[PDB]
Assembly symmetry: D2
Homo-oligomer: 47 residues x 4
């Protein structure tokens, strides 16, 4: 029953998992979420 | 794979149980902690 | 700012003396990012 | 400890070699990657 933004981020993640089918699910998933944060951090740091 | 489906089901269960205010931060914290838990076993 | 964040990190390493340096350091920096994200948002 | 001093010296060397625009993001990425590298060795 999640909010729309949460469903969108979960759908993007599920799409990435199905496209890559990582041999190390946890490492791929941690790298993915740490990169999504990194992307939003660039907006937050900007002048 | 079955291990991937299990880890994805565990994550989806955590998201539905917590319904985080910051989805990205909760998800990064979750996966970093799952790695930390497996590191203890692997060392 | 970089020297101050490096000094804070070195101080944390010397105060905690972790048995797992890499895990402590990754947790530390991931938490510093988490803290800054809240303030920036 | 010797292993901790070596990892701290490697990190300080990386900071001086890259001089990152975003110190915190570079440092988090660095330690997360050092863990990733050790995970591959531990799983082998």
């Amino acid at each position: 029953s999640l909010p729309k933004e949460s469903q969108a981020e979960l759908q993007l993640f599920q799409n990435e998992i199905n496209a890559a089918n990582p041999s190390d699910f946890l490492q791929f998933s941690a790298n993915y979420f740490n990169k999504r944060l990194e992307q939003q951090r660039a907006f937050l740091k900007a002048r």
